[PDB]
Design a protein around this ligand. Structure first.
Ligand SMILES: Cc1ncc(CCP(=O)(O)O)c(CO)c1O
Ligand SMILES: Cc1ncc(CCP(=O)(O)O)c(CO)c1O
Ligand SMILES: [Mg+2]
Ligand SMILES: [Mg+2]
Lengths: 291, 291
């Protein structure tokens, strides 16, 4: 139906869960904040497994390749998770680049990456060649913009040089504009860097991460997922909840992250339906009452 | 309503005689890099002798007024007054002074993403800068200019200051990019502003063309009748649009960024504000209507 941002408790919670085949969790702001996990999250995931409900995970974080992200889950207390369940914007970025750059031998090119080691590793694991890697540098056939702490005017210029070639793709991991840190400060997100590259190159970027449907496409290619029977749980309205709506799932805003209840209710009175969560909880831990 | 008809023969003589003076854009009109446009110096002289005032507008925020005056001289343009020169750096300094003169004796500093020339221009106006020697006052404004030292690090700082809602966000201009002599591009302030805006969740007050504030700077210094003034530039989305918004007559010259076909494309698309009244291959052609 049309989201009304109802608190998910009691019967509603029992219906919604029992109905669902599985849940898609965003990670940051939902399962953890920095190194401090959200109390109960580990327990919830376990009890979801006993109930026979599948779990998948999405993240616009392009800092950790899938292996290290799997280790992170492990180290933090989340047991029995497989790396195949993890879908980051980095992973999905690599997967798109492999889809768009497959070609006969002589068709291979390099990817110019504005981003960290984790992102590079993710691209290599998919079989992609990177510019700036040791050896002969093939013709750059793609520019990828991710979270780049080494972002510079020099490298922005370089990205644009590559993008002068209209046959060079422009991909971005996501459009998240900024992220909160532990000390209460913010860090610019790929969205702000993509904005710079797009503006400077006069180009539109193919975005893979939430709220782009492509991230969900990666997931449906790996697992049977019925959006009607899936819950999308996230902490950000403009990425997680909008994502859920575009994919046809039921959306649950959790309040342990970026967005607030009042922000959601503003979108509701404002009539921006696609930015309003069907339901909300204070923590994903609250979802355990329904098990 | 502009028809982008070539200005030649009789028309050229009429239009010039009609005008009080001409507003010249600099890059792409008077010069390209170190190579002046043949005839340009000669044109200015013949314009002054004919009793027509000449002013100059530029979205270039690299050079403070003194150095820009030297550039003109050194390149062959003699007898120019510094008051005739209006850059985005200049008007940015003038705006920040106008918006921060509030009655409280408690003044603050401006955090500048840009080169010495830009900082120099603000110091000339009496503004204090972050990163200057001494106590650093409360940052009361962030200014985005052409910043070759742009970094993720500095972007992050800018956003920290902008967390304070009473801190202004100003940008010199929104030019997305600029062509260089060798044929390469360099990102423009527009791309840098896009990053700051996106990451700060803020809109910037733009000072340069096609914002009318550039013209406001000019009218406070000189009596200018837009109806009798010629706006000559090489860029459609800044110079020509600026011209229309100010109510002047527009002349595209082809020695720079824009092409005749780009203008004619806007014409068919029905975007009148981006179509030049007249056009010439060079500003040199304007001498045919003089003596
Ligand atoms: C560098 C970087 N990139 C993306 C994100 C968003 C993570 P999520 O909430 O899981 O979508 C974060 C979250 O803090 C981040 O630090
Ligand atoms: C850093 C920078 N900023 C702005 C411009 C455009 C100047 P104009 O054509 O005089 O409006 C240029 C043109 O080269 C530039 O290099
Ligand atoms: Mg999140
Ligand atoms: Mg120009």
């Amino acid at each position: 139906g049309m989201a009304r941002c109802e608190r998910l408790r009691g019967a509603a919670l029992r219906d919604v869960l029992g109905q669902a085949q599985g849940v898609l969790f965003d990670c940051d702001g939902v399962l953890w904040n920095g190194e401090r996990i959200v109390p109960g999250a580990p327990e919830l995931l376990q009890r979801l497994a006993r109930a026979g409900k599948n779990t998948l995970f999405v993240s616009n974080n392009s800092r950790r390749a899938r292996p290290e992200l799997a280790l992170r889950f492990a180290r933090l207390g989340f047991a029995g998770l497989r790396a195949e369940q993890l879908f980051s914007s980095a992973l999905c970025a690599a997967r798109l680049l492999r889809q768009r750059l497959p070609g006969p031998p002589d068709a291979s090119g390099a990817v110019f990456v504005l981003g960290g080691e984790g992102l590079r590793a993710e691209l290599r694991a998919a079989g992609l060649r990177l510019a700036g890697d040791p050896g002969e540098d093939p013709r750059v056939r793609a520019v990828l913009v991710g979270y780049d702490e080494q972002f510079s005017f020099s490298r922005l210029t370089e990205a644009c040089a590559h993008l002068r070639d209209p046959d060079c793709l422009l991909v971005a991991t996501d459009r998240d504009p900024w992220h909160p840190l532990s000390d209460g400060s913010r860090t610019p997100g790929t969205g702000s860097l993509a904005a710079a590259v797009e503006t400077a190159s006069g180009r539109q970027a193919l975005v893979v991460g939430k709220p782009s449907p492509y991230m969900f496409q990666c997931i449906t290619e790996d697992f049977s997922v019925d959006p009607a029977r899936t819950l999308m749980v996230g902490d950000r309205l403009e990425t997680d909840i909008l994502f859920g709506h575009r994919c046809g799932m039921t959306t649950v805003l959790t309040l342990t992250g970026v967005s607030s209840l009042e922000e959601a209710q503003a979108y509701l009175t404002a009539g921006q339906r696609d930015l309003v969560p069907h339901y909300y909880v204070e923590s994903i831990a609250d979802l355990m009452e329904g098990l």
